[PDB]
Design a protein around this nucleic acid. Structure first.
Length: 88
RNA sequence: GGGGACCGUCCCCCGACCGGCGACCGGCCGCCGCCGGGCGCAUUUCCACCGCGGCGG
């Protein structure tokens, strides 16, 4: 891997233009199991007990709530940017 | 005034023709599903409890 190769001068704005990065990056040459089987341990059984993970639920609630739409943001607190007052 | 014939219509048999088994029914083979009873009794399946457990609501 390499660095960003695009120094940022304003948040969301790169220094170099779209065509400038084409030359800098040199693109002109760089172009292009649910189920497991295990034996049972008894004769006249077959030893072919196929078991699946994530089995079907044994109970379903009478009503369910629909899922919410997507937000493309609202990061959890653990990854928020920590801002410190300049006088500190 | 009778009774017949004819015409139009239904009601019937009796055939033969096409279309369809339709939401009008059965019998047979096929496929699928379920139930009951056998066999299958154990790394399968199920039940219940515990963990200051992990995930989604």
């Amino acid at each position: 891997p390499h660095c960003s190769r695009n120094p940022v001068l304003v948040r969301g704005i790169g220094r170099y233009s779209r065509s400038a990065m084409y030359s800098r990056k040199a693109m002109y040459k760089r172009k292009y199991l649910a189920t497991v089987t295990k034996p049972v341990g008894g004769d006249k059984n077959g030893g072919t007990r196929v078991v699946k993970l994530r089995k079907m639920p044994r109970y379903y609630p009478t009503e369910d709530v629909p899922r919410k739409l997507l937000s493309h943001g609202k990061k959890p607190f653990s990854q928020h940017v920590r801002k410190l007052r300049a006088s500190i």
